Amino acid sequence: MHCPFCRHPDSRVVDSRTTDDGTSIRRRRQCPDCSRRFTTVETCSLMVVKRSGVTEPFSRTKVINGVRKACQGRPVTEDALAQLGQRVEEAVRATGSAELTTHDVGLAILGPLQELDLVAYLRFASVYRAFDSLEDFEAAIAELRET
Amino acid sequence: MHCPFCRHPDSRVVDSRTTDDGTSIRRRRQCPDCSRRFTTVETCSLMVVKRSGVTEPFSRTKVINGVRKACQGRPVTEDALAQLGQRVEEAVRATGSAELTTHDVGLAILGPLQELDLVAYLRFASVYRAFDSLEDFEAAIAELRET
Amino acid sequence: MHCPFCRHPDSRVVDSRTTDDGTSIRRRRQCPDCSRRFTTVETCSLMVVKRSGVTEPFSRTKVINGVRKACQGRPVTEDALAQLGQRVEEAVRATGSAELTTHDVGLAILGPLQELDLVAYLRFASVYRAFDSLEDFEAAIAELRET
Amino acid sequence: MHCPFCRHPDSRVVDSRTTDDGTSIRRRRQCPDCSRRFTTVETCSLMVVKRSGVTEPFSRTKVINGVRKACQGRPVTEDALAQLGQRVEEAVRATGSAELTTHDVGLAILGPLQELDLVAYLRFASVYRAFDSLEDFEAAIAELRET
Amino acid sequence: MHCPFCRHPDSRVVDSRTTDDGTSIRRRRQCPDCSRRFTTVETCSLMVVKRSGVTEPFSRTKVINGVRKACQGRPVTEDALAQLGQRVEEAVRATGSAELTTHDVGLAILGPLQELDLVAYLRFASVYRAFDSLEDFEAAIAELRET
Amino acid sequence: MHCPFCRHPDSRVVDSRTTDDGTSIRRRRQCPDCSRRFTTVETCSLMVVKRSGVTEPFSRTKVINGVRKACQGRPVTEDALAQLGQRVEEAVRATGSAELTTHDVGLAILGPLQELDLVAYLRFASVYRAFDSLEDFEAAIAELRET
Amino acid sequence: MHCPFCRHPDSRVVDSRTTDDGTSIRRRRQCPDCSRRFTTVETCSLMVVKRSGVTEPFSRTKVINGVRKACQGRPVTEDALAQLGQRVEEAVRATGSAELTTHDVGLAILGPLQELDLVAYLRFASVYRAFDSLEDFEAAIAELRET
Amino acid sequence: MHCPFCRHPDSRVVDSRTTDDGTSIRRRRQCPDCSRRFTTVETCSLMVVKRSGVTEPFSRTKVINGVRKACQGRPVTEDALAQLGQRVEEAVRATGSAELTTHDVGLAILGPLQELDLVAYLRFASVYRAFDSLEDFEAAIAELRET
Amino acid sequence: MHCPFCRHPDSRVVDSRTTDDGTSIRRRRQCPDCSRRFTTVETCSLMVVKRSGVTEPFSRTKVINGVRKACQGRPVTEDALAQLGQRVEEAVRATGSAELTTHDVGLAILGPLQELDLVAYLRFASVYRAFDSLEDFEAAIAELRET
Amino acid sequence: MHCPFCRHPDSRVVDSRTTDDGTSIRRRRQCPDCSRRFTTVETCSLMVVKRSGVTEPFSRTKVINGVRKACQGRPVTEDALAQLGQRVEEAVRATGSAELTTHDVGLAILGPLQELDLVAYLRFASVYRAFDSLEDFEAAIAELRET
Amino acid sequence: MHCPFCRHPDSRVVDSRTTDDGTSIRRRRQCPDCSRRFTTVETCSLMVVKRSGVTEPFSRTKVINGVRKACQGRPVTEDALAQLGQRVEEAVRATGSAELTTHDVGLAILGPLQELDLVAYLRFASVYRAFDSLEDFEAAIAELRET
Amino acid sequence: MHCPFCRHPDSRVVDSRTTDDGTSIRRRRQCPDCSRRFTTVETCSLMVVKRSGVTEPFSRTKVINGVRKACQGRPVTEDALAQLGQRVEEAVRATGSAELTTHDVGLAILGPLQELDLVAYLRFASVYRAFDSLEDFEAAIAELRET
Ligand SMILES: Nc1ncnc2c1ncn2[C@@H]1O[C@H](COP(=O)(O)OP(=O)(O)OP(=O)(O)O)[C@@H](O)[C@H]1O
Ligand SMILES: Nc1ncnc2c1ncn2[C@@H]1O[C@H](COP(=O)(O)OP(=O)(O)OP(=O)(O)O)[C@@H](O)[C@H]1O
Ligand SMILES: Nc1ncnc2c1ncn2[C@@H]1O[C@H](COP(=O)(O)OP(=O)(O)OP(=O)(O)O)[C@@H](O)[C@H]1O
Ligand SMILES: Nc1ncnc2c1ncn2[C@@H]1O[C@H](COP(=O)(O)OP(=O)(O)OP(=O)(O)O)[C@@H](O)[C@H]1O
Ligand SMILES: Nc1ncnc2c1ncn2[C@@H]1O[C@H](COP(=O)(O)OP(=O)(O)OP(=O)(O)O)[C@@H](O)[C@H]1O
Ligand SMILES: Nc1ncnc2c1ncn2[C@@H]1O[C@H](COP(=O)(O)OP(=O)(O)OP(=O)(O)O)[C@@H](O)[C@H]1O
Ligand SMILES: Nc1ncnc2c1ncn2[C@@H]1O[C@H](COP(=O)(O)OP(=O)(O)OP(=O)(O)O)[C@@H](O)[C@H]1O
Ligand SMILES: Nc1ncnc2c1ncn2[C@@H]1O[C@H](COP(=O)(O)OP(=O)(O)OP(=O)(O)O)[C@@H](O)[C@H]1O
Ligand SMILES: [Zn+2]
Ligand SMILES: [Zn+2]
Ligand SMILES: [Zn+2]
Ligand SMILES: [Zn+2]
Ligand SMILES: [Zn+2]
Ligand SMILES: [Zn+2]
Ligand SMILES: [Zn+2]
Ligand SMILES: [Zn+2]
Ligand SMILES: [Zn+2]
Ligand SMILES: [Zn+2]
Ligand SMILES: [Zn+2]
Ligand SMILES: [Zn+2]
């Protein structure tokens, strides 16, 4: 990493410790040229921006609850819901963005949910793909037969 | 009744009053321990059996909130939702079923909801008409085109 | 209470039980004339309507937290904050309304908060009394000297 | 680093990459237990000491949210709030204090906030200028009339 | 359904069978985790609302046990208790009340119990006829002498 | 205490310790004449003999539950029930017997229960005083008017 | 299942939910002909009838404790006892009866216990097979040599 | 001694009395906190070391209950069991062992139990004579035929 | 307090917060002349120096345990021991020293212990007052008679 | 025996060996679960009954530690303490008491301790000779002067 | 095992029970010749002697903490540290000694620690192998290259 | 500040006093609940950021203890350690770093420690100079030979 003071191309790591909660790693680095020591923090935090304008930490439990409610009346097991939540969280974190919108969360859910149950996928994409008339629903039923 | 402040198991009744309509009784109570007064209302409210064994008081607010969450992203005004809720409550009161469940409450909304919107109606009716297959959605789409 | 079926002026109570959680009392009444038995529930539930349009149960902890944050930098004890929360909850419940707006909650807070601390009261009423210019603040400082 | 999915204490580093700017490092990590990959970013971020001993990364979002909550009920646009946050961040970066606390961050907002509004400025400056008395509010009101 | 052995949340259905009478369905299920099979029976059983909001399946065994505990120390044979339970169940089935409570079940026992015994009847009827005063007991003693 | 070995009229206590659970006190005594050390245990254990022939430790919770069920439909508070249980336990222990029958427990309950509620006392003594006909109940109602 | 009202040969399931505790599944069915909706409950409850005449829920812990006491002084591990309890519970539930006698529980235990330990099996069957004289014990020792 | 009512750690001694026999001391105690009195008895009771390190007071009731549970299903009267318990207690008192264990107590029952019954004796002696093999049972059956 | 930078005679407090654990108070002060802000911490920590050379936080539980062991065989209650520990802690903290030796702790204990029990005080001062011969013990017994 | 590593309830015995002296048996055991071996030693050790009901193996180390803590601040060498411990163990082994308590172990130390020191002896003998009064200490001081 | 009374070459085991905490097994044995019953205890206790002269039970957590601190700044995982602690405990227990010195504990740690990390092994053996000058460190670095 | 005795959240300030030096303030406080007084000291102490985010007051005692534990087994006197600690504290005070971490404190010890000893210096400098390889130890050994 570039030294904050002299902008040297590289620096050496002289201390590293994982935080007690395990979320972040605190490192202390020293610049080889100017011999100056600076502190850096490495995190894996993820945030979702609510439609009301408030950002809150990502939660797999809320995704599982939402997909469970959307799968009401269908034969879905708890192991399948947990696996779907894990897949959604992994796919969301793979983008690398620190914060994302809940619409993108729903779009990510749309993938595994189709493999889970077709009725729940249809009644979920009717909201998150913005269906406007019966024709849009009929086209979606046709895409599912093609896939 | 348990005190709302200090959770004392028993509370006296300072006074009681029957409303002019006669379907409600309003009581003022005082906790023997903390000597802090509060108020209670007793009504012969219509109960609905949930999907579990728990019975819950009927509330038009929950019906309106559910249909609005089903109507999100659609051009549905609040006046139409209020009229739909009033019609559903009137229907469930007029039927006078021996054992009223929340499934029957969800069934009473399909009628009024069909006139308001078709996308929201299809979403809502996909649950309480127990949709098992995509072909069942197509049959409802054909019925909506006929109506 | 009036009998739901025959609208008799009064009815007799033949059963009563406090709920396990203690929030409500379930009574069973019998009409003296038509000999018909009906069930009533007595509750003390209280709800606050958020500015976002969602109603949630009243909480004294949130009131205490808000007044504590508004009293930042001032000599306020935890016993005083707990007593203020108790007073606010008692005054709110005394109105008898099942649901109220958070603006009314702030107006109720405005009473005891003035007795608690003047600076916090000023910086709280500047929001909940809708002060517009410096003149409104100066008039409030004058009312506090008069009181 | 603890795995975000299964909370395994240690995680390998699949790969690392230094950004073009050079002030950040982006790493892809994999959990040895569940074999689920995620991403982390390490930056030499400016830390602020809170009112407790806990140090928190600097975020313009928190400053903007706080000033907006102070500016509620006032004709303040979002562009003005963004400009105020940018000015505050630039000021705190330019001062280069040896030990930067959140109190100094709250002090850097009074300047820009005085131009935007007077009610919101008086609310915000009543805290970080440590207002003890009503007369202190009057002196600030006189200063605002002069400026 | 949760497995009775290892409490796994979901269980498959190995097979199902409809009984000759047609009012019951007997299923054999297997837990996916432990692969241990068990059996379940589904019936459209008559539910009674307890003194709380909890609904419980009707059981003549509970009625017989309660009346026997009320008949302790009295010359009442088991055949008479069985006949009383059968009569009470037949009465509650024949009335076909819209909302059947345990209070009505306790009321259906007073009739048959009056013939069997007078001490046990007076004990049992002191509850469900809501006896408030000693004079109410005397009026029931006079009624028993008349009958 | 008499020495177990030589039957000396008195002995001296040389060690004493209360048990960790606090139920018993273990003492070590030495005989002044023969200089012999022996161990004694002091207990306050109390047992009730069930009608099935099994002896179990005395419990105030069971007494409270029984009197609560016998007071069904009557205005009895939890503090009153706890005080009645305490009085029953104290009166039972005052006799000094290590074991007693549940009939004696009911006879002890009969005292405070009359002061608590007359209806519950009547329906409890009808079982624990062995009433045989309506005449026995009428005589009991007369004794209550006299007292 | 047959419709309770019109006795139609079959009915359709329109709602299903597993209970929170997971013991039962509540279904709502609708008759295709008369369009009437009725509620059914599916359970896996099991009861054992004590020799005193009281029925209590089946417990694997009590079976394990009994076989452990019967295996006193013998080399039996806790894993073996847990497996024996699981086998006993599975064999008991395989019969399909909702309630069974403890004698049948002992007869079920007699199977795996013989494979576990011969001495414990002998001293357990001497009670649950009703041995009368030494000849019955000698014959049992001979059956074990044959098997 | 801990109070039986409120569990206060220490209790005073209101009075003490030595019995006429001299082997017991009866004390009346009062709790300083709740001021509720109770009674205690101190005796130099004979202790038996259980299979663990815990020592328990000797009780003929436990011996009689154990032998009766061993004698279930056999024509053994209660008088014979009482005589057996008296003989066992007399034997264990007369031996005067330095360290008396419950194993020795179980050994003192085989003698008297041999005369009462043979099936119950064989069951009981299969434990405390440490039966390892079926041949050991056969040798005891041969000994019983000789005696 | 003097300003750390310019040594001004006095400074103003502009921020104060009690720590979450409540042990310390963190204040932020500003010098009136040089307008410089500095952080101070107020603590009430107390340490005892073990004879092995290690300093550990003061504990009332250890003092109570020590005095309890020194009072073995004497009539001392738990309330008295707790009060003695409280008195010892208060007297130790009254000196104002952050760290003290365990010998001073014993000297502080010597005060209340004499009022508690004379035998324990003698056997405790024989260690913490360094008695050398029987004459020193005799003189101490004489001082106790004088006091 | 529970495994020391993973706490598995049962452990096999890899091998056993009887020592040359014959008073000990050394076994090597292996846990079935983790397959980690350990060693155990079984001896017919002399047990002492503590002040509670718990029996503890006799250990000269505890006696030496206790007397040393009593001898602190006194010119007592470690060789003298070892000789005292050896003498006490020899005495308690030679007496062969039927029921050996820790009080008798504390009594066996007074003899040897009288020769070693007088201050430490007086401290130690103030406990196990049950000193009630200062005059009892004076009588022991007179006895020490005579001896 | 040899009989404690008559020194017979072998004895038979007639009772065995594992302790509730699982640390020890209590056996009761009987001598075939003199027919005398004696109690033995089998334990797996392990103790470490601190350099201050106090013996305390062996703890794997302390070993893990020590090696973790010695591995500061090195890539060591928690699973590796737990495995090293398990190996150290197993190797220590394999010697069969009931008590050992902490120097031997460090010597045991020296084995796996070399396989874990070379820098930590060097900085740990510099203390537990008593390095005196730079030459001793250089020789150790040479042994590591050879191994 | 929380009371050290009863943990009451808030404590009054009985009195305050500024020390002659002026860098400390000594206050006497009293708890409102228990009315037990204690003392507190407030100083503008130099804080060091630990390897985590927690800041800790600087203490020469910790530095001396750490270096002594590093110097164990070496001929280093306590006076030399005190001089080293004084030099390290003077150096860290004289540098006046903007953000002082414990890593910099560990770096300030290498200088003075090089003169005192070479083995202890090599141990201590193997951590804070971040030794990755054995060759890095050899380079430091060569540097020590040069110096
Ligand atoms: N904290 C959270 N972490 C992760 N995903 C979340 C979180 N909160 C909500 N979600 C996801 O976002 C979806 C919500 O989408 P939507 O934008 O309609 O809701 P919202 O605006 O958050 O809800 P609300 O109506 O309560 O304001 C949920 O179905 C869920 O999958
Ligand atoms: N207490 C109530 N009063 C009136 N209408 C209700 C009540 N509870 C639910 N409803 C409405 O009746 C329908 C019942 O929906 P649904 O079967 O999903 O409810 P539920 O029992 O709450 O389900 P779940 O408990 O699984 O979330 C919806 O339209 C809902 O808005
Ligand atoms: N659940 C609650 N129960 C009781 N009082 C509440 C509750 N939530 C908020 N309040 C009160 O209402 C006040 C909030 O007023 P305001 O209308 O500005 O907030 P809001 O709209 O609820 O907040 P938000 O900005 O998070 O949507 C709080 O200071 C508190 O006293
Ligand atoms: N463990 C107990 N401790 C104290 N009192 C008890 C206990 N168990 C029961 N009781 C008292 O004894 C009364 C029971 O009297 P009764 O002889 O009719 O019952 P029982 O024979 O114990 O009951 P069951 O019918 O269950 O065998 C209860 O009302 C209660 O007051
Ligand atoms: N709640 C229970 N669930 C399952 N099995 C049980 C339960 N209670 C007892 N059992 C089984 O039944 C056996 C008891 O048989 P038995 O008929 O002799 O006892 P009981 O009549 O229940 O006992 P008691 O003498 O206490 O009245 C036990 O060994 C155990 O295996
Ligand atoms: N952490 C502590 N906090 C407060 N008081 C303590 C603490 N530890 C010990 N004490 C007090 O100090 C006394 C100990 O005095 P002493 O100097 O003989 O012990 P020590 O050197 O600490 O013990 P050890 O022999 O275990 O090293 C105890 O009786 C107790 O009152
Ligand atoms: N297991 C043991 N083996 C040998 N000697 C012991 C043992 N336990 C205690 N002792 C010694 O015997 C005497 C008993 O002292 P004391 O009565 O105070 O012990 P205690 O039962 O441990 O007391 P407490 O449990 O109340 O601390 C002391 O001299 C003690 O060192
Ligand atoms: N209770 C324990 N159980 C097992 N191992 C231990 C225990 N306590 C310490 N150890 C081991 O012994 C090592 C300590 O060696 P050392 O002799 O230097 O310490 P010590 O004398 O016990 O410590 P102290 O300086 O605190 O008195 C630790 O690194 C650890 O591996
Ligand atoms: Zn640089
Ligand atoms: Zn209250
Ligand atoms: Zn009516
Ligand atoms: Zn993982
Ligand atoms: Zn299962
Ligand atoms: Zn004697
Ligand atoms: Zn039908
Ligand atoms: Zn008490
Ligand atoms: Zn200054
Ligand atoms: Zn293991
Ligand atoms: Zn022998
Ligand atoms: Zn206090």
XYZ file of C-alpha atoms in Angstrom, chain F:
147
model
C -27.185 -35.224 74.103
C -26.457 -38.689 75.474
C -23.188 -40.232 74.334
C -23.940 -43.176 72.001
C -21.214 -45.327 73.583
C -21.399 -44.704 77.348
C -24.837 -43.013 77.654
C -23.423 -40.010 79.516
C -26.125 -37.438 80.398
C -24.525 -34.585 78.424
C -21.928 -33.980 75.720
C -20.036 -30.954 74.409
C -20.169 -29.622 70.848
C -16.707 -29.197 69.318
C -17.579 -28.607 65.652
C -20.539 -27.234 63.696
C -21.098 -26.422 60.025
C -24.164 -25.549 57.972
C -24.531 -27.608 54.803
C -23.927 -25.971 51.426
C -27.591 -26.280 50.437
C -28.505 -24.977 53.904
C -31.005 -27.729 54.716
C -29.016 -29.422 57.497
C -26.353 -28.603 60.083
C -23.621 -31.172 60.741
C -22.167 -31.122 64.254
C -19.320 -33.067 65.832
C -19.605 -33.664 69.577
C -17.208 -35.070 72.172
C -18.207 -36.849 75.373
C -16.541 -35.240 78.425
C -16.027 -38.553 80.246
C -14.949 -41.157 77.678
C -13.422 -38.537 75.279
C -15.196 -40.053 72.200
C -16.182 -37.933 69.145
C -19.485 -38.634 67.270
C -21.316 -36.903 64.342
C -24.935 -35.613 64.393
C -27.104 -34.045 61.686
C -29.912 -31.530 62.250
C -32.604 -31.295 59.568
C -35.948 -29.593 58.943
C -37.208 -32.008 56.294
C -40.961 -32.393 55.814
C -42.792 -35.085 53.849
C -46.377 -35.646 52.703
C -47.732 -39.160 52.189
C -49.705 -39.432 48.957
C -52.879 -41.516 48.948
C -51.056 -43.897 46.581
C -48.592 -44.739 49.369
C -45.593 -42.658 48.228
C -44.015 -39.962 50.409
C -42.743 -36.809 48.712
C -41.228 -33.548 49.996
C -43.660 -30.831 51.023
C -44.235 -28.169 48.367
C -45.919 -24.795 48.818
C -46.402 -24.467 45.049
C -48.755 -27.463 44.953
C -50.828 -26.036 47.816
C -51.040 -22.690 46.011
C -52.076 -24.396 42.764
C -54.749 -26.446 44.517
C -56.264 -23.481 46.327
C -56.099 -21.439 43.103
C -58.043 -24.104 41.207
C -60.526 -24.340 44.084
C -60.922 -20.534 43.930
C -61.786 -20.531 40.213
C -64.229 -17.786 39.285
C -63.637 -15.892 42.540
C -61.765 -12.600 43.181
C -58.527 -13.963 44.656
C -55.154 -12.285 44.157
C -51.750 -13.933 43.819
C -50.421 -12.194 46.938
C -53.305 -13.648 48.956
C -52.620 -17.125 47.561
C -48.911 -16.848 48.390
C -49.728 -15.706 51.928
C -52.172 -18.604 52.334
C -49.490 -21.037 51.187
C -47.014 -19.547 53.656
C -49.559 -19.846 56.475
C -50.334 -23.462 55.555
C -46.640 -24.381 55.481
C -45.982 -22.665 58.817
C -48.962 -24.352 60.488
C -47.945 -27.757 59.116
C -44.351 -27.390 60.326
C -45.509 -26.207 63.766
C -46.750 -29.714 64.619
C -43.189 -31.065 64.558
C -44.016 -34.254 62.656
C -41.539 -35.215 59.945
C -44.225 -36.832 57.763
C -47.946 -36.131 57.492
C -50.865 -37.217 55.324
C -52.388 -35.072 52.587
C -55.710 -35.205 54.450
C -54.060 -33.258 57.271
C -52.714 -30.851 54.638
C -56.264 -30.257 53.425
C -57.473 -29.811 56.998
C -54.760 -27.188 57.510
C -55.822 -25.478 54.270
C -59.428 -25.380 55.509
C -58.520 -22.694 58.057
C -57.155 -19.800 55.989
C -59.329 -20.722 52.994
C -62.476 -19.832 54.946
C -61.033 -16.370 55.592
C -60.063 -16.127 51.912
C -63.328 -17.024 50.157
C -66.514 -18.683 51.385
C -67.498 -20.379 48.111
C -64.065 -21.969 47.690
C -64.076 -22.994 51.353
C -67.466 -24.673 50.928
C -66.491 -26.524 47.752
C -63.197 -27.578 49.397
C -64.669 -28.761 52.707
C -67.336 -30.669 50.777
C -64.411 -32.910 49.789
C -62.127 -32.733 52.829
C -64.873 -32.809 55.483
C -66.715 -35.676 53.718
C -70.146 -34.183 53.137
C -72.709 -36.887 52.374
C -76.042 -35.166 51.630
C -77.509 -31.669 51.047
C -78.178 -31.409 54.832
C -74.392 -31.396 55.553
C -73.917 -28.507 53.051
C -76.825 -26.544 54.622
C -75.324 -26.978 58.137
C -71.926 -25.708 56.854
C -73.590 -22.582 55.311
C -75.172 -22.001 58.774
C -71.785 -22.339 60.588
C -70.304 -19.721 58.194
C -73.183 -17.264 59.025
C -72.558 -17.912 62.783
C -68.790 -17.256 62.244
